């Protein structure tokens, strides 16, 4: 495929460099239209710029710490860090959020990879052989309430068990109710004066609960669980203006008050280089 065509002198009443950008069309003017060029080839296909490649590499989406300790003298096992819950969303990390939020609608198959790492900040004599349970709680299912709750039996809910230090990896089909995920929603849950804007069950993938299924020991081990998401079979619609300002909340377009200027002011006048 030719990138630049061979082109000589021009003396014509057709002027390809003059146009009206007011029409909303960006004319496909080529280097050969402003000056005289030689024939050269593209010798490139653009595989690394495909939407499947731009969104199809792993990025961390959640990090959480859980502890193996006795549940005696505790009223809340989640506040004791014996188990932890994650409202599934891809908007907690700004590096991934800005790439994905560059389109209005995206439809993709997910691939989760969970990395659990152990740590003994307090006195321990050996590296404990802990097994972590990651439980998917779809909307409507009972979220675990205790580290040894009846919910963890998981008679129907998907659940994965793996050794701490190692990793687990499972694929998830497109779970949205609509034909594509909504990255933005200019609307509400119901016709109400006080209801939530944008954040609504349109962006509710469900929840994931994490616990150490091993019994409690004599030593405290803090396990940092890291969830990574990699998209497959990605499709995207309605490209959008890129995010410029820092974020403030998940699922909402707000930015901080008194924010710093985003345009990098030049040193000198408009004529300096």
């Amino acid at each position: 495929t030719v990138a630049s065509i061979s082109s000589g002198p021009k003396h014509t009443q057709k002027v390809p460099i003059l146009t009206a950008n007011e029409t909303g069309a960006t004319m496909p003017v080529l280097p050969s239209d402003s000056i005289e060029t030689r024939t050269t080839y593209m010798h490139f296909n653009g595989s690394e710029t495909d939407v499947e490649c731009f969104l199809g590499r792993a990025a961390c989406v959640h990090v959480t710490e859980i502890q193996n300790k006795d549940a005696t003298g505790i009223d809340n096992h989640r506040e004791a860090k014996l188990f932890n819950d994650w409202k599934i969303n891809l908007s907690s990390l700004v590096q991934l959020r800005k790439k994905l939020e560059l389109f209005t609608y995206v439809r993709f198959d997910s691939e989760y990879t969970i990395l659990a790492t152990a740590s003994q900040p307090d006195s321990a004599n050996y590296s404990s052989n802990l097994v972590v349970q990651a439980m998917y709680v779809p909307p409507g299912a009972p979220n675990p309430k205790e580290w040894d709750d009846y919910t963890w039996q998981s008679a129907s809910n998907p659940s994965v068990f793996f050794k701490v230090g190692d990793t687990s990896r499972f694929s998830v089909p497109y779970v949205g109710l609509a034909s594509a995920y909504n990255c933005f929603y200019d609307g509400y849950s119901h016709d109400d004066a006080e209801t939530q804007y944008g954040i609504t069950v349109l962006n509710h993938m469900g929840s994931m609960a994490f616990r150490i299924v091993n019994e409690h020991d004599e030593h405290k081990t803090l396990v940092k669980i890291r969830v990574y998401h990699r998209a497959k079979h990605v499709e995207a619609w309605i490209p959008r203006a890129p995010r410029a300002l820092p974020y403030t909340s998940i699922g909402r377009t707000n930015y901080p008050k008194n924010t710093e200027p985003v345009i990098k002011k030049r040193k000198g006048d408009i004529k300096s280089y």
Binding site: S47, E52, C53, V172, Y174, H233, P239
Partner: protein, 40 residues
């Protein structure tokens, strides 16, 4: 070779090879050819 039953288990589809930027660069009702006056 696919080692699982579901399509969601598969690897990526590679690249959508047929591209056309015109639907984003020139989404105009009447077609405009470069060199002819945009307006007359």
């Amino acid at each position: 070779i696919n080692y699982y039953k579901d399509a969601a288990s598969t690897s990526s589809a590679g690249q959508s090879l047929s591209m056309d930027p015109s639907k984003f660069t020139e989404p105009v009702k009447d077609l405009m050819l470069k060199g002819a006056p945009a307006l007359n």
